[PDB]
């Protein structure tokens, strides 16, 4: 159900997430 | 299909 961030989200740059 | 961002 949820997408939570693994690292700090960044302006104008992609970052890593995981589904839970 | 849809997942919500926390």
């Amino acid at each position, epitope marked *: 159900l949820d997408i*939570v*961030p693994l*690292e700090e989200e960044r302006k104008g740059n992609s970052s890593k997430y*995981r589904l839970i | 299909s849809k997942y919500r961002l926390i």
Partner: antibody
Amino acid sequence: QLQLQESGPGLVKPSETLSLTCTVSDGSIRDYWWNWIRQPPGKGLEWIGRIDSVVNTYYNPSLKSRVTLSVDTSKNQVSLRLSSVTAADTAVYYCARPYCPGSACYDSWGQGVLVTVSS
Amino acid sequence: EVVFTQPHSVSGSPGQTVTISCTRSSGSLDSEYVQWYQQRPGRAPTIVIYRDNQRPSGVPDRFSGSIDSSSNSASLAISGLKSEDEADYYCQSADDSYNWVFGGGTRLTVLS
């Protein structure tokens, strides 16, 4: 916002290791990140480093040699260990954890623990 | 390497609008989000602005964040100034390695 149970010694002797912890109560220790900050009383904010759930660590170059950041998912806590301390490391230390009431997140800081370094 | 410099002191009378600037020394300020922290004496810093211009619930609409890529600066504007707004203010952003960098801090006085 987040109650974050920050804990540490009031007093640490030089060349000991100063160690602090913070814990979460929402079950989230396996995700997100922690930032660590400190403030010499009456001076500005200095960032120490970050540990996150990629399990990358980020450090202030001034301190990287002396800093260890760790997460114990069993105790639901982060720990900061700062080695080879001097009286110049006397500061209020803060842990910062992201608070997410929805899709957006902003950081919530601990109460602050003043560590005095003195032999 | 990169620093964010702030005025040491900003002052204004009740009802006036005050601005606190935060200028980045190298690289584009607009490349990383800018946060603004408020610190009342003896208490931990709390967010008043995050992601350049977003306000937590519980922070008045009197607080405004802005970005100016021409001056390479961020600004925190507080309108309708009140005695409760008296505090220290820190900008927080990041460098090309994603390490946090704080501004030097600004003491805001509500002139009485």
